[PDB]
C-alpha cells in the first residue's frame with residue numbers, strides 16, 4: 001500500500017500503449033495512440049493488475065487480470081467494450 005502498482009501493454013508501430021494502475025482498490029487505465037495520454041474506459045475493482053494483449057490481423061484483444069484477496073477477475077477487450085471473461089482460479 002506504499003505505492004501504486006502498474007501493468008503495461010502495447011501493440012502496433014505507433015504504438016498504442018495501455019497502462020493500468022491499481023490504486024486504493026481500483027484499477028484505472030491511461031492510453032496513448034500517438035497524440036498524447038488520455039484516460040481509458042477501463043475502471044474495475046482490484047488491488048493488483050496484470051495484462052496481456054495480442055493481435056489477430058487488425059483486431060486487438062486485451063486481457064486484464066484484476067485481483068482482490070484471492071479472487072482474480074478477467075476483463076476482456078475484443079473490439080466492442082470490456083466484458084467479463086471466463087477465467088477462474090482457486091487460490
Ligand SMILES: OC[C@@]1(O)OC[C@@H](O)[C@@H](O)[C@@H]1O
Nearest residue numbers: 018029031039040041042077
Ligand atoms: O479509448 C481507447 C480505448 O477504447 O482503447 C481500447 C481500450 O483500452 C479502452 O478501454 C479504451 O477506452
Ligand SMILES: OC[C@@]1(O)OC[C@@H](O)[C@@H](O)[C@@H]1O
Nearest residue numbers: 063074076078084085086087
Ligand atoms: O472471448 C473471451 C474469452 O473466451 O477469451 C479467451 C479467454 O480470455 C477467456 O477466459 C475469455 O472468456
